[PDB]
A paper describes a structure:
Human leucocyte antigen E ([name]-E) is a non-classical MHC class Ib molecule homologous to H-2 Qa-1 in mice and Mamu-E in rhesus macaques (RM). VL9 peptide-bound [name]-E complexes engage the natural killer (NK) cell inhibitory receptor, CD94-NKG2A, thereby protecting healthy cells from NK cell-mediated lysis.
Reflections from multiple isomorphous [name]*P9-Phe complex crystals were merged in Xia2, yielding a dataset in the P1 space group to 2.5 Å. Superposition revealed a slight elevation in the P9 Cα atom of [name]*P9-Phe compared to [name] and an alternative rotamer for the F pocket-lining Phe-116 side chain, which tilts more acutely towards the groove floor, increasing pocket volume to accommodate the larger aromatic side chain. In line with diverse and non-canonical SIVGag epitopes defined by Hansen et al., we provide structural evidence illustrating that the B and F pockets of [name]-E can tolerate a wider range of side chains than previously predicted.
Residue numbers in the entry:
A (entry chain P): 1 to 9
B (entry chain A): 1 to 220, 226 to 274
C (entry chain B): 1 to 100
Amino acid sequence: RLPAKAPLF
Amino acid sequence: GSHSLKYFHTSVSRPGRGEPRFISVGYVDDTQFVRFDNDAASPRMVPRAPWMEQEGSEYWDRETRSARDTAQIFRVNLRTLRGYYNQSEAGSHTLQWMHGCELGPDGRFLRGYEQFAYDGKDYLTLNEDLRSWTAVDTAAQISEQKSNDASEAEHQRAYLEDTCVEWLHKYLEKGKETLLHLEPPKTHVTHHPISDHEATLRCWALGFYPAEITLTWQQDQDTELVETRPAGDGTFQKWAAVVVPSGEEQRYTCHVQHEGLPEPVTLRW
Amino acid sequence: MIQRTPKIQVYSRHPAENGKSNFLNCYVSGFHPSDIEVDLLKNGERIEKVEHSDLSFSKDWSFYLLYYTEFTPTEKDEYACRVNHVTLSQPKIVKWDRDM
């Protein structure tokens, strides 16, 4: 499945 | 053989139009099975493979929430990186994300990866140990330090080593009738004389799955290869050509290596 | 900013045979940024209902897309692909060669 979120840069 | 679960995300900023376009595609080996595209009234994750259409509404609701969260984060990130590099808002910019995990022949975890790019160049790269991030540009190190403080490598490593593997196995089970089926290539050699002195021999490989293949010309000169291309039905195509003196055509053989072949194949015109 | 010019391939899903049903393909790859224009041509006129795959990209971050439609090859009809990109000074035409 997709990761829940992506990191904020 | 080996298997993999890979996702590719693309976000492209629209300078004066508000929200950026966000597209996400998911792959199992060389087969696409899902898609999320925010160019819609109420964007959702949809199936792109027939073995995914029995999946329940709870699966699609959560992937949609994860995709929407990711797209919001990417939109903020485009705004921040434009500040980092002192870029004007006159232009449109791109932020891409690729990550995946791959199994070995034994079915267990072999490797994972994760990488970020801004306008087509490496912005942030997860190191092969899945334990630290690396940034090339000086500005990118601002994001690297944010992620080192937040222990982002530890969250990403947990996804790749446990979650990605557990769901890759589930997809291989749901679609094994067509995902575990090897399609060997159909191969034949053609001949078209350029002139009285020379002729072209072209070695064809058609309708094979997966995409990985090798075509080699060998003499009992330079070879022209083409990029492996999609046929449109899930198989791939490729050919390799060489210019040979007329009368000596039988001297050259073509060697074809593919995972669907019981043994490599040798061809003569 | 990195800009990459597109590779173009025009080809049929099956080996070409006059009078037999087939699929015309235009494969664009290795281009950057993602925004692109692609049209399939029949005797110079644009084919109406061409579909395309979902955007995705290669290991080197460059994008690829497949445009396709049903067609019927004949000895006299010529098919082509029309691609325009920021890297191009003018749209490029690639003719379909059934032997490639």
